[PDB]
């Protein structure tokens, strides 16, 4: 609605954004040195994705991974992952064993996505470097029998008097942790049983192979804590309160730099789909870690994507247009990508993104909220056109 508005306002962001010439992760980095900058000495960085299916979007992050592991000293990566898959992941890229493919969820087992997974493997095989990349599985919409394992060995090695005990709180309640669809089926009375089961084992292990074992006991503990609510905003909060607290756990427990994978709806700094999603871990690392958090979120223009189902099987679909979203007028922009740091920008471009605008964003499943695009992210990576990810 402002002056003369679109034209003017395309060239104030054209002139203040910094283009990408690839998504290629082998090829070299010198178009993310603006990155580096932007990002200063944050410990903290969200990297968000669009949709949960477009090709180039997993490509690019991965390749803004590899610029962080390897020019930025980045080691913890955090994905929006369940605990379990991230335990099979981790053991993936520390020695080599396993599939990949098995330990992520579909959309995820996709050849973009596996192509980092073993570029971390790889890069962890390099006895030259000393520091190795973590892999952390956030999430908690399921807890496979492994997470119950990682506990009962460690107990029956180095806690033997307690094995009996531990075995016998976990026992019934691993039967039920498949996903939360068949956890949330219990009655109140076993919901509130099993948390207490679980914090009565997360205490034993307290202190008050070690790392992982306390971590897990908590991952469980956490899981029967955010299922006891019977509503829904409230475990939607506990949830993001989770991810939130897993992702700071790595970096106090491994130190280094944390990165947070996830979709732009978790990442964020503030709410984008209320209904949905009223609370997102990344406003609570926002408020806990302030400006120790930078948060990158992900924008596309045009194209089709990888989803579930429409309004299940894999399938693909086509982003809507809204000539008024923030989408739209990133792609008129002369750049096919490009970096913008949202926090810095003057003139036009400045009152655009502080702005209310309707903003692109799609799930799983099936797509614009009003919101301001600063107000979410600190930094955004657009790649005007975009197409379908390949489930491998």
Same mark, same amino acid.
């Given at each position: 609605?402002?002056? !003369? ?6 060239? !104030? ?12 992760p082998s090829?070299p980095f010198? +178009?993310l040195?603006?990155?580096k ?6 410990? #903290? ?18 390749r803004l991974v590899k610029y962080l592991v390897t020019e930025m000293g980045f080691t ?30 579909? =959309? ?5 996505? *596996?192509?980092?997974?073993?570029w971390m493997?790889d890069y962890?095989?390099d006895?030259s470097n000393?520091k190795?990349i973590?892999?952390?599985?956030? +999430? =908690? ?12 060995? #460690?107990?029956?090695?180095? &806690? ?39 914090? &009565? ?5 307290? +202190? ?34 989770? /991810? ?44 806990? /870690? ?28 086509? *982003? ?22 949202? &926090? ?12 209310? &605008?309707?903003? =692109? !964003? ?10 301001? =695009?600063?107000?979410?992210?600190? *930094? ?10 390949? *489930?491998?």
């Amino acid at each position: 609605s402002g002056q !003369s508005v679109q034209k003017n306002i395309v060239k !104030s962001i054209q002139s203040q954004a910094n283009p990408l010439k690839t998504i290629e992760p082998s090829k070299p980095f010198e +178009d993310l040195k603006p990155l580096k900058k932007m990002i200063g000495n944050a410990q #903290y960085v969200g990297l968000g994705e669009n949709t949960h299916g477009s090709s180039e979007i997993f490509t690019m992050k991965f390749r803004l991974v590899k610029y962080l592991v390897t020019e930025m000293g980045f080691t913890n990566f955090a994905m929006e992952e369940d605990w379990g898959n991230g335990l099979k992941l981790n053991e993936y890229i520390q020695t080599g064993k396993g599939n990949p493919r098995e330990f992520l969820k579909l =959309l995820y087992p996709t050849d973009e996505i *596996i192509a980092m997974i073993e570029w971390m493997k790889d890069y962890n095989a390099d006895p030259s470097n000393k520091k190795k990349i973590q892999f952390i599985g956030l +999430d =908690l919409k399921a807890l496979d029998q492994g997470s119950f394992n990682k506990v009962i060995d #460690y107990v029956r090695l180095h &806690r033997p008097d307690l094995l009996a005990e531990v075995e016998e709180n976990y026992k019934e309640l691993s039967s039920f942790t498949g996903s939360i669809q068949e956890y949330m089926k219990l009655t109140p009375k076993l919901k509130e049983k099993f948390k207490a089961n679980a914090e &009565r084992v997360a205490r034993l292990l307290k +202190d008050e192979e070690y790392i992982w074992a306390k971590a897990t006991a908590s991952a469980i503990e956490k899981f029967t804590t955010m299922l006891l609510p019977n509503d829904y905003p409230s475990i939607i909060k506990l949830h993001e309160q989770y /991810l939130a607290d897993h992702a700071m756990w790595a970096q106090e427990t491994f130190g280094g730099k944390t990165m947070v994978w996830a979709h732009n709806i978790h990442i964020a700094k503030g709410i984008i789909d209320e209904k949905l999603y009223p609370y997102v871990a990344g406003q609570f690392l926002k408020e806990r /870690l302030d400006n120790n958090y930078v948060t990158i979120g992900s924008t596309t223009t045009e194209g089709n994507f990888t989803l579930y189902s429409e309004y299940g099987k894999i399938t693909t679909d086509t *982003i809507p247009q809204d000539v008024k979203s923030f989408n739209y007028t990133l792609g008129k922009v002369p750049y096919k990508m490009f970096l913008l740091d949202n &926090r810095h920008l003057k003139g036009q471009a400045e009152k655009w993104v502080k702005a209310k &605008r309707p903003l =692109l !964003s799609i799930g799983g499943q099936i797509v614009y909220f009003d919101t301001s =695009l600063l107000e979410q992210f600190d *930094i955004i990576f657009h790649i005007r056109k975009t197409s379908p990810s390949h *489930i491998k």
